Write a protein that binds this ligand. Sequence first.
Ligand code: M1P
Ligand code: MG
Length: 448
Amino acid sequence: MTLPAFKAYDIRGRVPDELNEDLARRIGVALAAQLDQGPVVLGHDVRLASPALQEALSAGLRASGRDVIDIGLCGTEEVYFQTDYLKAAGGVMVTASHNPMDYNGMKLVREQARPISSDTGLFAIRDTVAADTAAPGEPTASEQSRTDKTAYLEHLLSYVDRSTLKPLKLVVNAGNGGAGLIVDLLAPHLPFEFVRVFHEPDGNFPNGIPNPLLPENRDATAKAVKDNGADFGIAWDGDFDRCFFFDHTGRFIEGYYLVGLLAQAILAKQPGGKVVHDPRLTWNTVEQVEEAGGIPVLCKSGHAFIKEKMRSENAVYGGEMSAHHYFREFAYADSGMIPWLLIAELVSQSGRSLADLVEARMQKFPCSGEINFKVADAKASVARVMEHYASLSPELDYTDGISADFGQWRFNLRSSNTEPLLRLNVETRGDAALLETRTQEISNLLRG
Ligand SMILES: O=P(O)(O)O[C@H]1O[C@H](CO)[C@@H](O)[C@H](O)[C@@H]1O
Ligand SMILES: [Mg+2]
């Protein structure tokens, strides 16, 4: 047995048996040993248990001679921004994301908010913690509280020309996570008319744990949009590093289409830039990026792959279909705030609704949505799919699972690196009927 809470990208488990204040304190001790010189930024989400896990992190860190910058209740992206902006040695965000009520977790970064993942420190942290039986030392460094968000808010606003913004009517749905705080601090500097839904942070989640992808949660933002004649609606996950868009009809916009949209928005800022994208769904992104004068860069999905690739390529923007958007100027980190500011600016400047901006693209490259299969034998199931399609001679690429291009349609089939699952994505060249028959044909094969 190894500590179950240590995953590929972060730490998450049930408190107290998979994650607790003792483990959190040991993690702080262990993280001090893994970072270069400098202070460590700490932050936490709205969960009731999160501050105590932060305080243990801080105690272990300061017992190890690390100055601690407590930035308080915040979104994950604030930890990334402050870690990089303040030139810290690293940062930890205590966040349970959309795990159950009795779960919590941490996301860890080193200098310039570079991810710490299982193969880049996180398992080395785990191994140290698992063998650490030492007595907790006492503090030999200080903790300072740094709640000023001015630098962060100014950074967010710098992505748009505020004189070109229109008084759009925007539904905002923090899901009782933490996004409402940042919306409200931005609001005085924006002309938008906000319709606030599930706005107050409440770690008891009276309206459900924040997760806009679940249909009942999706419909609350949809309803608010349609009922209020909003221009569009934005919903966030709890630590708001993910945002989700609803057009003026209340229709949720599948994340695939936000990648090409945001890339076109950004490439009008940065001519000729590179855009990193994942291989699950591609054709639209590639065409929208080239059409906007940029260069698309294919990259294995997963935030740490995306971020490393953006760095090596100097890519201005990176987008994943699963509602993750990374920005070079934002320390190559993801933000749940930059994207909607960019979209609001695009609608304001173009005179086009969010619906119109994506409508033709969704018709031209219709996609299945990511479809998950839990199966008895992932390898055997994947082979059953590949054998069935072999006689059609698809063009195959193994960048991230299997990508098979048949000409008028393609799919990607992946093993998740964060769950024991197979994940299917299918798209076609403007053919809804071929999309359905091929999705069902593949689905039946995987379920075989
Ligand atoms: O499909 P996987 O392996 O479970 O990866 C998912 O989690 C990553 C990190 O959040 C994301 O970066 C991925 O894009 C995806 O959301
Ligand atoms: Mg999140």
